[PDB]
Amino acid sequence: ASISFTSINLYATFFPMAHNTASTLEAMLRNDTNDQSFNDYLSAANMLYP
Amino acid sequence: PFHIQVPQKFFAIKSLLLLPGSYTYEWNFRKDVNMILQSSLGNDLRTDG
Amino acid sequence: IPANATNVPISIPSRNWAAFRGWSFTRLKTKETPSLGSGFDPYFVYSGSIPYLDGTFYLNHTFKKVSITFDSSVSWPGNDRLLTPNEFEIKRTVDGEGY
Amino acid sequence: IPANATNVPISIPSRNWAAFRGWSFTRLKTKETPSLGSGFDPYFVYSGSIPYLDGTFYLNHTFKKVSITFDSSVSWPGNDRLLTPNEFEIKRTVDGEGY
Amino acid sequence: IPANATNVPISIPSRNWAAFRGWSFTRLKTKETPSLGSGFDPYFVYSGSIPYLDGTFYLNHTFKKVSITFDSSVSWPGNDRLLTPNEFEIKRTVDGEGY
Amino acid sequence: EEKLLLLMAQLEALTQRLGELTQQVAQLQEQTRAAV
Amino acid sequence: LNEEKLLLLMAQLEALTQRLGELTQQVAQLQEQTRAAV
Amino acid sequence: KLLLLMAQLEALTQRLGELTQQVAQLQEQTRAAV
Amino acid sequence: EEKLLLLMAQLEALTQRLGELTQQVAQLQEQ
Amino acid sequence: VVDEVNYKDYQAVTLAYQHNNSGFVGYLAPTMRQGQPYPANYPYPLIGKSAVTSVTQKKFLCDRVMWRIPFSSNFMSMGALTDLGQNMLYANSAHALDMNFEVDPMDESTLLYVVFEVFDVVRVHQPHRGVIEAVYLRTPFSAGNATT
Amino acid sequence: NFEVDPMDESTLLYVVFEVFDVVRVHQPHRGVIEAVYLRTPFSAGNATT
Amino acid sequence: DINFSSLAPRHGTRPFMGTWSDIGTS
Amino acid sequence: DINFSSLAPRHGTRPFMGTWSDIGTS
Amino acid sequence: APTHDVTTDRSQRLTLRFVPVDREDNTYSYKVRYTLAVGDNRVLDMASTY
Amino acid sequence: APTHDVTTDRSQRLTLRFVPVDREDNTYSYKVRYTLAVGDNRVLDMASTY
């Protein structure tokens, strides 16, 4: 078995949004207290022992 | 094979500001070859071909 | 759609489009579709599953493009919202941009 | 009408229909009708009666329907009038309602 | 422009464009252009009309398109302004509906 | 840089000159075969 | 930019093959009974 | 990825020349009925 | 007859074109 | 499937000249067995050692689904009365719609079924016993829009 | 739409669209004549004008 | 969606003591 | 809980006069 | 230059082309009917039509 | 629905792709670097990138 990558591109899709409402949104996400936060679904410390 | 642009010459509508709404604009063109083609001799171009 | 023909030219007269929603489309076969507006259609010689009435379409995969024009001059998917920026393409056969 | 064809689609551009009266219709032959777009038609090789100008119609019994719609969603003799409301039928072969 | 090239890409860094006017462009040749940055210049073997220091341009019919974009994702006059929105074309072969 | 760009774009412009020869074969099968 | 111009002759090729072998090598089976007719 | 281009488009030509033959034994045999 | 001479002649035209550009690939994958 | 141009031992064999299960199945018919045990020659290997050069064919089927394109600027509807249905109460006066479609060839006559999605309001009222009334109205396509 | 019986010859379908076609003729002085034509359902095409 | 907003009054259920009863137009 | 998923500062709302989505902030 | 009241603002084309809505062919003449539509908040000049 | 007050009117692509600005090919790995750019007044979600 063998493989070779020819061509890799990065697709993205923007929601089309009114510029007034998407700069209101920007204003309220550039602020300190409007920080985004995520969890790792399984938060883990991986320890594998022989 | 020709490609040409032809302007309006009718005085009423050649400098008019047409305001919003739908309009019907329709005009006729001539396929007479003595009437749309000039010559340097003025020979009949319907019998020339 | 004529036999072996590759395009369908559809044109709708000037019409109000107030409270218009989308469109839908599917391809049928003439012999499998009965003519409604008749008490008897004597040329209907089919009796299998009628796709028209039963909703059991199966020729949705023969479309390769559709395009919309309003006013006779403005492509509706033409506010630069698509990678093919003046029509939809359903199937692309011969792909070289990875679409 | 090309020949051996059973439907003739005919349509008119959008326009106001104020002061409109009826319609009439009749069928002619392309062999028996000169072209009046020119002053001389070299393809007119008939010298018999011309129904276009002499009113010598004889081919009105070939019609079997006419259907009139406006904007492709209004049917003109519609709103229930005729026995079959949305289409005139000049003649019906294969009957069963005693039409 | 390498010999027999069909494209020239330009990339400019992120830069403030306050008080910015247009662009102009023309094509010159390597041998008909000296460098003014070095007062030494032994590779200049031409002596005709130098279209760099004199407006004697003559290769402005050798351009086919120019595409302008900001942030590699915004086509600048692409508010549908042009009849071909995403690029200017200086010239094209085949009218393609009288363009 | 632009030698190699043009090199393989002259082999994608040579398959569109073999692309309309399939249409010159298709005359044997014909097209739009409906009748009046 | 010269790596996004690759692989685009390897799927043009695929389409072409089935239009140059279904219109070539199956016209070579149309020489067994058709040679003077349309 | 350039070895692919040079070797599979020198394989393309095999049935380019056979297609020349096929039409010359069909559409040139209608110009000389068999 | 004319349309056959736009198939036969173009098959043999682009045999030459194709062949010389495969060679170009082989010497510019070494540069 | 086999690459018919870049495989150099490609022979186009027809149905007649294909054999496989030789001696254990009938000759082009659901009838009794015929023939001798012999090597096959029908499908070309695509797997294992001695696999032939191949092309890739890809398609999809959609059955029981009509294609639909919403008449909304963002192509998702967040309300039955679309946002562009309500830009036709201020920027409408009637316009033409021309749609072009490209379809595969079919060897038989086909129809295209285009559905133009509207409101069909069926509305009914009784004002007295044994009396029933109704008014039926539709918006972008409607009947009684050029006659009474 | 119309449905006509098939016929082997090429045929035409003649549809008369019945309108008004009134002319008013005034002679306001000796050797002066004036005429004005009205056709109302067809004025923006399908009337040659 | 395809057309379905053809729904009820957006009431809630009537209040009671002992889970159920009927009050009509009250 | 046992594996994380606690998120969401959202409820959703649609102003009256039908259900009319977006209040566009109050 | 004026920084307001000349700006395009919203997307709109600055050139349109309208295909005929009807055409008749005659041996001595030709006829093409169009629907020439000017959207709201746009003013056409009929000097620039051809 | 909203009266177009939640959507753009100045023209922006929905679907985009960012070509590599660098590619490194190796004997066991591939590294692809892109510039992922978000135009002003646009909202990008990294759920819709792939």
Side-chain angles (χ1 to χ4, degrees), chain I:
Chain I
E1 296 175 63
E2 297 185 312
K3 287 59 165 179
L4 307 178
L5 300 174
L6 298 177
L7 174 56
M8 293 179 72
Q10 301 312 115
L11 285 163
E12 294 178 359
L14 302 172
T15 290
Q16 303 315 114
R17 293 290 291 104
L18 187 59
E20 291 169 62
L21 288 167
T22 45
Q23 292 309 111
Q24 285 307 116
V25 173
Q27 59 182 72
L28 294 175
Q29 66 185 68
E30 298 179 0
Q31 291 301 112

PDB file of all heavy atoms in Angstrom, chain I:
ATOM      1  N   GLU I   1     -18.544  15.055 -45.574  1.00  0.00           N
ATOM      2  CA  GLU I   1     -17.162  14.707 -45.816  1.00  0.00           C
ATOM      3  C   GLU I   1     -16.205  15.630 -45.102  1.00  0.00           C
ATOM      4  O   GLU I   1     -15.140  15.206 -44.657  1.00  0.00           O
ATOM      5  CB  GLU I   1     -16.836  14.721 -47.328  1.00  0.00           C
ATOM      6  CG  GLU I   1     -17.631  13.664 -48.121  1.00  0.00           C
ATOM      7  CD  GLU I   1     -17.354  13.810 -49.617  1.00  0.00           C
ATOM      8  OE1 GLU I   1     -16.177  13.616 -50.023  1.00  0.00           O
ATOM      9  OE2 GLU I   1     -18.314  14.117 -50.373  1.00  0.00           O
ATOM     10  N   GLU I   2     -16.577  16.931 -45.018  1.00  0.00           N
ATOM     11  CA  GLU I   2     -15.838  17.996 -44.383  1.00  0.00           C
ATOM     12  C   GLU I   2     -15.595  17.761 -42.910  1.00  0.00           C
ATOM     13  O   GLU I   2     -14.549  18.144 -42.395  1.00  0.00           O
ATOM     14  CB  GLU I   2     -16.571  19.356 -44.527  1.00  0.00           C
ATOM     15  CG  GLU I   2     -16.723  19.819 -45.992  1.00  0.00           C
ATOM     16  CD  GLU I   2     -17.340  21.219 -46.058  1.00  0.00           C
ATOM     17  OE1 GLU I   2     -18.372  21.447 -45.370  1.00  0.00           O
ATOM     18  OE2 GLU I   2     -16.790  22.076 -46.802  1.00  0.00           O
ATOM     19  N   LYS I   3     -16.581  17.167 -42.196  1.00  0.00           N
ATOM     20  CA  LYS I   3     -16.561  16.956 -40.762  1.00  0.00           C
ATOM     21  C   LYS I   3     -15.681  15.800 -40.355  1.00  0.00           C
ATOM     22  O   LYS I   3     -15.326  15.675 -39.183  1.00  0.00           O
ATOM     23  CB  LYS I   3     -17.977  16.697 -40.172  1.00  0.00           C
ATOM     24  CG  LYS I   3     -18.906  17.927 -40.092  1.00  0.00           C
ATOM     25  CD  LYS I   3     -19.185  18.617 -41.436  1.00  0.00           C
ATOM     26  CE  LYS I   3     -20.377  19.581 -41.399  1.00  0.00           C
ATOM     27  NZ  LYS I   3     -20.585  20.223 -42.720  1.00  0.00           N
ATOM     28  N   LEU I   4     -15.402  14.879 -41.277  1.00  0.00           N
ATOM     29  CA  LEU I   4     -14.478  13.762 -41.081  1.00  0.00           C
ATOM     30  C   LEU I   4     -13.030  14.262 -41.149  1.00  0.00           C
ATOM     31  O   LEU I   4     -12.150  13.727 -40.479  1.00  0.00           O
ATOM     32  CB  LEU I   4     -14.733  12.674 -42.149  1.00  0.00           C
ATOM     33  CG  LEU I   4     -16.182  12.160 -42.276  1.00  0.00           C
ATOM     34  CD1 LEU I   4     -16.297  11.139 -43.404  1.00  0.00           C
ATOM     35  CD2 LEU I   4     -16.684  11.497 -40.996  1.00  0.00           C
ATOM     36  N   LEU I   5     -12.795  15.375 -41.858  1.00  0.00           N
ATOM     37  CA  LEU I   5     -11.482  15.942 -42.050  1.00  0.00           C
ATOM     38  C   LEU I   5     -11.224  16.941 -40.950  1.00  0.00           C
ATOM     39  O   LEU I   5     -10.174  17.577 -40.923  1.00  0.00           O
ATOM     40  CB  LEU I   5     -11.346  16.666 -43.416  1.00  0.00           C
ATOM     41  CG  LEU I   5     -11.587  15.756 -44.647  1.00  0.00           C
ATOM     42  CD1 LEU I   5     -11.583  16.578 -45.952  1.00  0.00           C
ATOM     43  CD2 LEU I   5     -10.585  14.585 -44.721  1.00  0.00           C
ATOM     44  N   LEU I   6     -12.168  17.060 -39.985  1.00  0.00           N
ATOM     45  CA  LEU I   6     -12.002  17.836 -38.781  1.00  0.00           C
ATOM     46  C   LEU I   6     -11.973  16.867 -37.635  1.00  0.00           C
ATOM     47  O   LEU I   6     -12.033  17.279 -36.478  1.00  0.00           O
ATOM     48  CB  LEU I   6     -13.161  18.839 -38.530  1.00  0.00           C
ATOM     49  CG  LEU I   6     -13.334  19.922 -39.624  1.00  0.00           C
ATOM     50  CD1 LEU I   6     -14.550  20.820 -39.321  1.00  0.00           C
ATOM     51  CD2 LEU I   6     -12.063  20.765 -39.846  1.00  0.00           C
ATOM     52  N   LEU I   7     -11.925  15.554 -37.877  1.00  0.00           N
ATOM     53  CA  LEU I   7     -11.717  14.513 -36.871  1.00  0.00           C
ATOM     54  C   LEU I   7     -10.391  13.825 -37.161  1.00  0.00           C
ATOM     55  O   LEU I   7      -9.473  13.872 -36.344  1.00  0.00           O
ATOM     56  CB  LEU I   7     -12.924  13.554 -36.881  1.00  0.00           C
ATOM     57  CG  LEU I   7     -12.797  12.313 -35.977  1.00  0.00           C
ATOM     58  CD1 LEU I   7     -12.510  12.654 -34.515  1.00  0.00           C
ATOM     59  CD2 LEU I   7     -14.101  11.527 -36.006  1.00  0.00           C
ATOM     60  N   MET I   8     -10.235  13.302 -38.380  1.00  0.00           N
ATOM     61  CA  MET I   8      -9.035  12.576 -38.741  1.00  0.00           C
ATOM     62  C   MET I   8      -7.774  13.405 -38.675  1.00  0.00           C
ATOM     63  O   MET I   8      -6.738  12.948 -38.191  1.00  0.00           O
ATOM     64  CB  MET I   8      -9.167  11.877 -40.120  1.00  0.00           C
ATOM     65  CG  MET I   8     -10.215  10.739 -40.093  1.00  0.00           C
ATOM     66  SD  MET I   8     -10.492   9.862 -41.671  1.00  0.00           S
ATOM     67  CE  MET I   8      -8.937   8.930 -41.734  1.00  0.00           C
ATOM     68  N   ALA I   9      -7.862  14.674 -39.141  1.00  0.00           N
ATOM     69  CA  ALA I   9      -6.741  15.581 -39.208  1.00  0.00           C
ATOM     70  C   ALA I   9      -6.369  16.153 -37.868  1.00  0.00           C
ATOM     71  O   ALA I   9      -5.258  16.652 -37.706  1.00  0.00           O
ATOM     72  CB  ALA I   9      -7.028  16.767 -40.147  1.00  0.00           C
ATOM     73  N   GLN I  10      -7.298  16.112 -36.883  1.00  0.00           N
ATOM     74  CA  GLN I  10      -7.085  16.718 -35.589  1.00  0.00           C
ATOM     75  C   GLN I  10      -6.644  15.675 -34.601  1.00  0.00           C
ATOM     76  O   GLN I  10      -5.995  16.000 -33.610  1.00  0.00           O
ATOM     77  CB  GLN I  10      -8.388  17.368 -35.070  1.00  0.00           C
ATOM     78  CG  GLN I  10      -8.966  18.463 -35.996  1.00  0.00           C
ATOM     79  CD  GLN I  10      -7.898  19.472 -36.443  1.00  0.00           C
ATOM     80  OE1 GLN I  10      -7.579  19.565 -37.633  1.00  0.00           O
ATOM     81  NE2 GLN I  10      -7.351  20.243 -35.454  1.00  0.00           N
ATOM     82  N   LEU I  11      -6.920  14.381 -34.891  1.00  0.00           N
ATOM     83  CA  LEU I  11      -6.379  13.253 -34.169  1.00  0.00           C
ATOM     84  C   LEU I  11      -4.890  13.181 -34.372  1.00  0.00           C
ATOM     85  O   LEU I  11      -4.145  12.934 -33.426  1.00  0.00           O
ATOM     86  CB  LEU I  11      -7.031  11.903 -34.562  1.00  0.00           C
ATOM     87  CG  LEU I  11      -8.454  11.710 -33.978  1.00  0.00           C
ATOM     88  CD1 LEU I  11      -9.220  10.592 -34.713  1.00  0.00           C
ATOM     89  CD2 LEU I  11      -8.436  11.465 -32.455  1.00  0.00           C
ATOM     90  N   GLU I  12      -4.431  13.405 -35.628  1.00  0.00           N
ATOM     91  CA  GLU I  12      -3.037  13.287 -35.982  1.00  0.00           C
ATOM     92  C   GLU I  12      -2.285  14.566 -35.692  1.00  0.00           C
ATOM     93  O   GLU I  12      -1.063  14.537 -35.554  1.00  0.00           O
ATOM     94  CB  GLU I  12      -2.867  12.975 -37.489  1.00  0.00           C
ATOM     95  CG  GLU I  12      -3.422  11.592 -37.885  1.00  0.00           C
ATOM     96  CD  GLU I  12      -3.281  11.328 -39.388  1.00  0.00           C
ATOM     97  OE1 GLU I  12      -2.770  12.217 -40.121  1.00  0.00           O
ATOM     98  OE2 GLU I  12      -3.689  10.218 -39.822  1.00  0.00           O
ATOM     99  N   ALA I  13      -2.997  15.717 -35.568  1.00  0.00           N
ATOM    100  CA  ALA I  13      -2.412  16.985 -35.183  1.00  0.00           C
ATOM    101  C   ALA I  13      -1.916  16.956 -33.763  1.00  0.00           C
ATOM    102  O   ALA I  13      -0.803  17.387 -33.463  1.00  0.00           O
ATOM    103  CB  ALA I  13      -3.409  18.155 -35.299  1.00  0.00           C
ATOM    104  N   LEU I  14      -2.744  16.394 -32.857  1.00  0.00           N
ATOM    105  CA  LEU I  14      -2.560  16.548 -31.441  1.00  0.00           C
ATOM    106  C   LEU I  14      -1.848  15.344 -30.891  1.00  0.00           C
ATOM    107  O   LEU I  14      -1.546  15.310 -29.703  1.00  0.00           O
ATOM    108  CB  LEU I  14      -3.909  16.721 -30.703  1.00  0.00           C
ATOM    109  CG  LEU I  14      -4.746  17.930 -31.195  1.00  0.00           C
ATOM    110  CD1 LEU I  14      -6.151  17.913 -30.569  1.00  0.00           C
ATOM    111  CD2 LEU I  14      -4.052  19.280 -30.943  1.00  0.00           C
ATOM    112  N   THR I  15      -1.528  14.336 -31.744  1.00  0.00           N
ATOM    113  CA  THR I  15      -0.564  13.300 -31.434  1.00  0.00           C
ATOM    114  C   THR I  15       0.818  13.899 -31.284  1.00  0.00           C
ATOM    115  O   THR I  15       1.536  13.586 -30.335  1.00  0.00           O
ATOM    116  CB  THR I  15      -0.572  12.188 -32.479  1.00  0.00           C
ATOM    117  OG1 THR I  15      -1.782  11.448 -32.372  1.00  0.00           O
ATOM    118  CG2 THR I  15       0.609  11.206 -32.300  1.00  0.00           C
ATOM    119  N   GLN I  16       1.194  14.807 -32.219  1.00  0.00           N
ATOM    120  CA  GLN I  16       2.450  15.522 -32.217  1.00  0.00           C
ATOM    121  C   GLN I  16       2.567  16.475 -31.056  1.00  0.00           C
ATOM    122  O   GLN I  16       3.596  16.524 -30.383  1.00  0.00           O
ATOM    123  CB  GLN I  16       2.667  16.313 -33.534  1.00  0.00           C
ATOM    124  CG  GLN I  16       2.629  15.450 -34.817  1.00  0.00           C
ATOM    125  CD  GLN I  16       3.441  14.156 -34.665  1.00  0.00           C
ATOM    126  OE1 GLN I  16       2.877  13.055 -34.673  1.00  0.00           O
ATOM    127  NE2 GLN I  16       4.794  14.306 -34.522  1.00  0.00           N
ATOM    128  N   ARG I  17       1.484  17.248 -30.795  1.00  0.00           N
ATOM    129  CA  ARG I  17       1.435  18.245 -29.748  1.00  0.00           C
ATOM    130  C   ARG I  17       1.585  17.639 -28.380  1.00  0.00           C
ATOM    131  O   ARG I  17       2.340  18.142 -27.552  1.00  0.00           O
ATOM    132  CB  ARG I  17       0.127  19.068 -29.785  1.00  0.00           C
ATOM    133  CG  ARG I  17      -0.015  19.971 -31.028  1.00  0.00           C
ATOM    134  CD  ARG I  17       0.936  21.180 -31.069  1.00  0.00           C
ATOM    135  NE  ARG I  17       0.537  22.153 -29.994  1.00  0.00           N
ATOM    136  CZ  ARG I  17       1.201  22.325 -28.821  1.00  0.00           C
ATOM    137  NH1 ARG I  17       2.354  21.674 -28.542  1.00  0.00           N
ATOM    138  NH2 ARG I  17       0.684  23.181 -27.903  1.00  0.00           N
ATOM    139  N   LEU I  18       0.867  16.520 -28.145  1.00  0.00           N
ATOM    140  CA  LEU I  18       0.822  15.781 -26.907  1.00  0.00           C
ATOM    141  C   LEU I  18       2.164  15.181 -26.577  1.00  0.00           C
ATOM    142  O   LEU I  18       2.603  15.221 -25.430  1.00  0.00           O
ATOM    143  CB  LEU I  18      -0.260  14.680 -26.962  1.00  0.00           C
ATOM    144  CG  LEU I  18      -0.543  13.925 -25.644  1.00  0.00           C
ATOM    145  CD1 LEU I  18      -1.002  14.890 -24.533  1.00  0.00           C
ATOM    146  CD2 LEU I  18      -1.586  12.816 -25.885  1.00  0.00           C
ATOM    147  N   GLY I  19       2.837  14.623 -27.610  1.00  0.00           N
ATOM    148  CA  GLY I  19       4.077  13.892 -27.511  1.00  0.00           C
ATOM    149  C   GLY I  19       5.224  14.786 -27.144  1.00  0.00           C
ATOM    150  O   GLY I  19       6.120  14.376 -26.408  1.00  0.00           O
ATOM    151  N   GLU I  20       5.230  16.042 -27.645  1.00  0.00           N
ATOM    152  CA  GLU I  20       6.327  16.952 -27.400  1.00  0.00           C
ATOM    153  C   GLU I  20       6.205  17.597 -26.041  1.00  0.00           C
ATOM    154  O   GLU I  20       7.201  18.083 -25.511  1.00  0.00           O
ATOM    155  CB  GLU I  20       6.377  18.090 -28.451  1.00  0.00           C
ATOM    156  CG  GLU I  20       6.775  17.592 -29.852  1.00  0.00           C
ATOM    157  CD  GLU I  20       6.541  18.701 -30.879  1.00  0.00           C
ATOM    158  OE1 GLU I  20       7.190  19.774 -30.751  1.00  0.00           O
ATOM    159  OE2 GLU I  20       5.706  18.494 -31.801  1.00  0.00           O
ATOM    160  N   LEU I  21       4.995  17.591 -25.435  1.00  0.00           N
ATOM    161  CA  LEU I  21       4.754  18.242 -24.169  1.00  0.00           C
ATOM    162  C   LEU I  21       4.889  17.280 -23.015  1.00  0.00           C
ATOM    163  O   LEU I  21       5.157  17.713 -21.898  1.00  0.00           O
ATOM    164  CB  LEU I  21       3.340  18.866 -24.132  1.00  0.00           C
ATOM    165  CG  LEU I  21       3.175  20.124 -25.020  1.00  0.00           C
ATOM    166  CD1 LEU I  21       1.683  20.481 -25.178  1.00  0.00           C
ATOM    167  CD2 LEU I  21       3.973  21.329 -24.480  1.00  0.00           C
ATOM    168  N   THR I  22       4.768  15.950 -23.261  1.00  0.00           N
ATOM    169  CA  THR I  22       5.129  14.898 -22.324  1.00  0.00           C
ATOM    170  C   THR I  22       6.621  14.905 -22.086  1.00  0.00           C
ATOM    171  O   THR I  22       7.076  14.779 -20.950  1.00  0.00           O
ATOM    172  CB  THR I  22       4.617  13.511 -22.712  1.00  0.00           C
ATOM    173  OG1 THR I  22       4.825  13.234 -24.090  1.00  0.00           O
ATOM    174  CG2 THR I  22       3.105  13.444 -22.392  1.00  0.00           C
ATOM    175  N   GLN I  23       7.411  15.107 -23.172  1.00  0.00           N
ATOM    176  CA  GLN I  23       8.851  15.243 -23.120  1.00  0.00           C
ATOM    177  C   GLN I  23       9.295  16.446 -22.314  1.00  0.00           C
ATOM    178  O   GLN I  23      10.257  16.346 -21.556  1.00  0.00           O
ATOM    179  CB  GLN I  23       9.502  15.281 -24.526  1.00  0.00           C
ATOM    180  CG  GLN I  23       9.424  13.950 -25.305  1.00  0.00           C
ATOM    181  CD  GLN I  23       9.926  12.768 -24.462  1.00  0.00           C
ATOM    182  OE1 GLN I  23       9.138  11.903 -24.059  1.00  0.00           O
ATOM    183  NE2 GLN I  23      11.267  12.749 -24.195  1.00  0.00           N
ATOM    184  N   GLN I  24       8.572  17.593 -22.430  1.00  0.00           N
ATOM    185  CA  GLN I  24       8.829  18.801 -21.667  1.00  0.00           C
ATOM    186  C   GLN I  24       8.702  18.610 -20.173  1.00  0.00           C
ATOM    187  O   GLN I  24       9.502  19.143 -19.406  1.00  0.00           O
ATOM    188  CB  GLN I  24       7.967  20.015 -22.100  1.00  0.00           C
ATOM    189  CG  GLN I  24       8.387  20.677 -23.431  1.00  0.00           C
ATOM    190  CD  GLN I  24       9.874  21.059 -23.427  1.00  0.00           C
ATOM    191  OE1 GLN I  24      10.661  20.531 -24.222  1.00  0.00           O
ATOM    192  NE2 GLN I  24      10.253  21.995 -22.503  1.00  0.00           N
ATOM    193  N   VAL I  25       7.700  17.810 -19.734  1.00  0.00           N
ATOM    194  CA  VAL I  25       7.482  17.425 -18.353  1.00  0.00           C
ATOM    195  C   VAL I  25       8.663  16.653 -17.806  1.00  0.00           C
ATOM    196  O   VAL I  25       9.054  16.844 -16.656  1.00  0.00           O
ATOM    197  CB  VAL I  25       6.171  16.665 -18.155  1.00  0.00           C
ATOM    198  CG1 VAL I  25       6.048  16.114 -16.721  1.00  0.00           C
ATOM    199  CG2 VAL I  25       4.992  17.618 -18.453  1.00  0.00           C
ATOM    200  N   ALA I  26       9.245  15.752 -18.632  1.00  0.00           N
ATOM    201  CA  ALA I  26      10.293  14.845 -18.233  1.00  0.00           C
ATOM    202  C   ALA I  26      11.632  15.518 -18.043  1.00  0.00           C
ATOM    203  O   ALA I  26      12.480  14.984 -17.330  1.00  0.00           O
ATOM    204  CB  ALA I  26      10.488  13.746 -19.295  1.00  0.00           C
ATOM    205  N   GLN I  27      11.841  16.720 -18.631  1.00  0.00           N
ATOM    206  CA  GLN I  27      13.112  17.405 -18.555  1.00  0.00           C
ATOM    207  C   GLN I  27      13.003  18.584 -17.621  1.00  0.00           C
ATOM    208  O   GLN I  27      14.019  19.189 -17.290  1.00  0.00           O
ATOM    209  CB  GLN I  27      13.584  17.914 -19.947  1.00  0.00           C
ATOM    210  CG  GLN I  27      12.612  18.885 -20.641  1.00  0.00           C
ATOM    211  CD  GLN I  27      13.146  19.283 -22.024  1.00  0.00           C
ATOM    212  OE1 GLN I  27      13.137  18.470 -22.956  1.00  0.00           O
ATOM    213  NE2 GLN I  27      13.611  20.564 -22.149  1.00  0.00           N
ATOM    214  N   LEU I  28      11.777  18.912 -17.138  1.00  0.00           N
ATOM    215  CA  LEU I  28      11.538  20.043 -16.261  1.00  0.00           C
ATOM    216  C   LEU I  28      11.090  19.533 -14.918  1.00  0.00           C
ATOM    217  O   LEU I  28      10.694  20.311 -14.052  1.00  0.00           O
ATOM    218  CB  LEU I  28      10.487  21.045 -16.810  1.00  0.00           C
ATOM    219  CG  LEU I  28      10.924  21.797 -18.095  1.00  0.00           C
ATOM    220  CD1 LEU I  28       9.783  22.678 -18.645  1.00  0.00           C
ATOM    221  CD2 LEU I  28      12.210  22.625 -17.894  1.00  0.00           C
ATOM    222  N   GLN I  29      11.240  18.207 -14.689  1.00  0.00           N
ATOM    223  CA  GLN I  29      11.083  17.593 -13.394  1.00  0.00           C
ATOM    224  C   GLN I  29      12.477  17.256 -12.926  1.00  0.00           C
ATOM    225  O   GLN I  29      12.646  16.587 -11.910  1.00  0.00           O
ATOM    226  CB  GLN I  29      10.210  16.310 -13.442  1.00  0.00           C
ATOM    227  CG  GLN I  29      10.786  15.116 -14.223  1.00  0.00           C
ATOM    228  CD  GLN I  29       9.735  13.997 -14.256  1.00  0.00           C
ATOM    229  OE1 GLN I  29       8.691  14.149 -14.901  1.00  0.00           O
ATOM    230  NE2 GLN I  29      10.013  12.865 -13.540  1.00  0.00           N
ATOM    231  N   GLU I  30      13.507  17.749 -13.661  1.00  0.00           N
ATOM    232  CA  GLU I  30      14.905  17.554 -13.370  1.00  0.00           C
ATOM    233  C   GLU I  30      15.546  18.912 -13.196  1.00  0.00           C
ATOM    234  O   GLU I  30      16.719  19.003 -12.836  1.00  0.00           O
ATOM    235  CB  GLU I  30      15.616  16.836 -14.548  1.00  0.00           C
ATOM    236  CG  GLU I  30      15.057  15.421 -14.815  1.00  0.00           C
ATOM    237  CD  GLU I  30      15.758  14.736 -15.994  1.00  0.00           C
ATOM    238  OE1 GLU I  30      16.674  15.348 -16.605  1.00  0.00           O
ATOM    239  OE2 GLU I  30      15.370  13.577 -16.299  1.00  0.00           O
ATOM    240  N   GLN I  31      14.767  20.001 -13.414  1.00  0.00           N
ATOM    241  CA  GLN I  31      15.208  21.372 -13.278  1.00  0.00           C
ATOM    242  C   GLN I  31      14.518  21.979 -12.086  1.00  0.00           C
ATOM    243  O   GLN I  31      14.650  23.174 -11.825  1.00  0.00           O
ATOM    244  CB  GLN I  31      14.872  22.219 -14.537  1.00  0.00           C
ATOM    245  CG  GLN I  31      15.678  21.829 -15.791  1.00  0.00           C
ATOM    246  CD  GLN I  31      17.184  21.979 -15.547  1.00  0.00           C
ATOM    247  OE1 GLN I  31      17.916  20.984 -15.504  1.00  0.00           O
ATOM    248  NE2 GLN I  31      17.643  23.259 -15.390  1.00  0.00           N
TER     249      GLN I  31
END
